[PDB]
Structure 1
Amino acid sequence: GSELSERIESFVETLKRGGGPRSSEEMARETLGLLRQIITDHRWSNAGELMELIRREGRRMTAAQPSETTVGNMVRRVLKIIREEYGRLHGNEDFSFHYAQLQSNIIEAINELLVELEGTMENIAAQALEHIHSNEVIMTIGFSRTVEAFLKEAARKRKFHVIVAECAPFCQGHEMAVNLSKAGIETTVMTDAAIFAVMSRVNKVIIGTKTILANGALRAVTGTHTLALAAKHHSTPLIVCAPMFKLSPQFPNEEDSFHKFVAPEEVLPFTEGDILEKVSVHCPVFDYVPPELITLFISNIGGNAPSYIYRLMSELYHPDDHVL
């Protein structure tokens, strides 16, 4: 049915134009709902033809927005699901050994994955209380709804200061701090020009992240590199509160347009005037935190050093799917 075609096309259009939906978990859930729709409304009987199909949409998607690693690695994971179920049932060539039984199993596995994907905020939130010992000064940055859920869960049984830098290109730290203080955390907004002066007085640095690569190194909302570099100069322990699907298996310099440059209007508004002729304004939104400044990923399975993250690739994505 062409309904799948129009749905996929509307999806990739929304991805190119402007984030849809906004919440990263919501985008992963939407990607999975779409991918399930492909496994109920297309022509396939083999497994190899379905892997080619999934790659033929995943290439389009991961080339639409090179910084939407969520949908990319979600397609990678459904590919891994295909590999696993086809190999367990029939079994390196993929043959059309059998039929719809495989599809029922695939739909069931995708339903399980989607259920694990929708209840991850609550997992990390229940994992908070063990980490936020009372009277900390937890320095976040930006607005990452997982970190807000983490903190306003942990502050239901303890008390701690919460510095929050705001992202200076366009301030979202403000909304995070407002949502925090509506739960009474004694939070402290500030512009992130002062991450180094007000770091010596910080106990633990709790940052979200947009995407975890396969070095452990991540790609997180801008100015978080310098926050991590300070919080390693002051050897405070970072905490990358990222669920497990914000995990692409690329590698740091194996990606061009790593960042995501947005309309330089936000950095130097058009109202400025003539001097907008001889100035190259850069508005990088995402910055590349190397893996040796991070300390402890807080994923839905528990805490993990960065040196365990590579193993997660070997347990989530197939080694021949790192090119989608």
Structure 2
Amino acid sequence: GSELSERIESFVETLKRGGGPRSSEEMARETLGLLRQIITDHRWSNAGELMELIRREGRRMTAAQPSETTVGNMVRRVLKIIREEYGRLHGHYAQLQSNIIEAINELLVELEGTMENIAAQALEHIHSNEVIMTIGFSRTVEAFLKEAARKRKFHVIVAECAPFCQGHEMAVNLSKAGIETTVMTDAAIFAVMSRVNKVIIGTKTILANGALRAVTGTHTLALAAKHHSTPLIVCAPMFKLSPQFPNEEDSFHKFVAPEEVLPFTEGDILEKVSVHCPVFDYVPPELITLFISNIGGNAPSYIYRLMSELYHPDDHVL
């Protein structure tokens, strides 16, 4: 299947060059579709060959971009599906393909439904005349906020990100719905984190110990929340949950060109000054209050069980 190899190479290049789709849901859906296509257009007799081929492909896709913790999750999910199916049929080498495809489709439809599954739980935690603040821009949190703005009324404060000011789009989108949102810088968090009653944010990846690898600036927000004793909620689907711990990992953050921090038109001082631009950061589990998932809320202390349920322990290394 040379066309399959071409699609795989294009995906790897767009992921390593400038990333795939802009939102994480589309990224996960495209990864799962590519995995389904690989499973369909390929020859194999035993499940071991298929699973090791998928392992190699996922290893390649992860080496293309290690900071994109959305494709490895789909690869591990497909591997777990294959293993569960093989154990159910053997606990087999002629009709294992169609059932894998059916399972993958079942996973796809719920992948799409995750957004509504999350947004439906907005009225359980938001009350009238509440003061909530957020940082960055996330579709999940945007829906979670604008879904309860029809019957409930509250105040929203959006803190922009210094390297890439992405909170402006979120503030504009929330103001278009009439939620009385306010815009501020990421340097006035602690200054205003005294009249706030709750915090809701979105993350990029959930580690195994209940930690978050979100955009740079959320660790300080969590520290200020824990100092002021304000519940900090994280709304993230299950595909943003990886079986890896904070340490035991190099290249945790993503370092981009210093152009966003210090422009190229400064002068000669750029030869002496050393500039670093981290995109993500690490947030320990002790500063998290609740996890709003597709299966309802959950405390940070109950993430290991979801890990054991979703992924296989032998597939953590991949």
Please tell me the TM-score bracket, short chain as reference.
Answer: over 0.9
How far is 1:151 from its partner? 0.2
How far is 1:294 from its partner? 0.4
Return the alpha-carbon distance in structure 2 between the equivalents of residues 288 and 124 of structure 1.
24
How many residue pairs get aligned? The number is 318
Q: CA deviation digits over 1:258-314, x for unaligned, max 9?
A: 000111110001011111011111110001011110010101110000111111011
- For residue 272 of structure 2, give the secondary structure of its aligned residue in structure 1: coil
Return the alpha-carbon distance in structure 2 between the equivalents of residues 45 and 188 of structure 1.
59
On the 8 A contact 2:122/2:147 being kept in 1, the answer is: yes
Return the alpha-carbon distance in structure 2 between the equivalents of residues 65 and 294 of structure 1.
27
- For residue 210 of structure 1, give the secondary structure of its aligned residue in structure 2: coil
1:87 aligned partner:
87
On the 8 A contact 2:253/2:279 being kept in 1, the answer is: yes
How far is 1:99 from its partner? 2.8
Aligned Cα root-mean-square deviation (Å): 0.8
Return the alpha-carbon distance in structure 2 between the equivalents of residues 9 and 187 of structure 1.
43
Return the alpha-carbon distance in structure 2 between the equivalents of residues 56 and 12 of structure 1.
13
Query: TM-score with structure 1 length normalisation?
Result: 0.97
* Identity percentage of aligned residues: 100
How far is 1:100 from its partner? 4.1
Return the alpha-carbon distance in structure 1 between the equivalents of residues 137 and 98 of structure 2.
39
Return the alpha-carbon distance in structure 1 between the equivalents of residues 125 and 226 of structure 2.
19
Gaps of 5+ in 1: 92-97
- For residue 248 of structure 1, give the secondary structure of its aligned residue in structure 2: coil
- For residue 88 of structure 1, give the secondary structure of its aligned residue in structure 2: helix
Q: Displaced runs of 4+ in structure 1, greater than 6 A?
A: none
How far is 1:217 from its partner? 0.6
Q: CA deviation digits over 1:28-63, x for unaligned, max 9?
A: 000000000011011112111111001110101111
On the 8 A contact 2:47/2:93 being kept in 1, the answer is: no
- For residue 240 of structure 1, give the secondary structure of its aligned residue in structure 2: strand
Gaps of 5+ in 2: none
How far is 1:156 from its partner? 1.5
- For residue 109 of structure 1, give the secondary structure of its aligned residue in structure 2: helix
Return the alpha-carbon distance in structure 1 between the equivalents of residues 304 and 257 of structure 2.
35
Query: TM-score with structure 2 length normalisation?
Result: 0.99
- For residue 292 of structure 2, give the secondary structure of its aligned residue in structure 1: strand
Matched, 1:236 2:247: no
Q: CA deviation digits over 1:173-192, x for unaligned, max 9?
A: 00011011111111111110
On the 8 A contact 2:204/2:215 being kept in 1, the answer is: yes
- For residue 187 of structure 2, give the secondary structure of its aligned residue in structure 1: helix
- For residue 316 of structure 2, give the secondary structure of its aligned residue in structure 1: coil
- For residue 103 of structure 2, give the secondary structure of its aligned residue in structure 1: helix
Q: CA deviation digits over 1:137-195, x for unaligned, max 9?
A: 11110001100010000111100000110111110000011011111111111110011
How far is 1:125 from its partner? 0.7
How far is 1:119 from its partner? 1.1
- For residue 271 of structure 1, give the secondary structure of its aligned residue in structure 2: coil
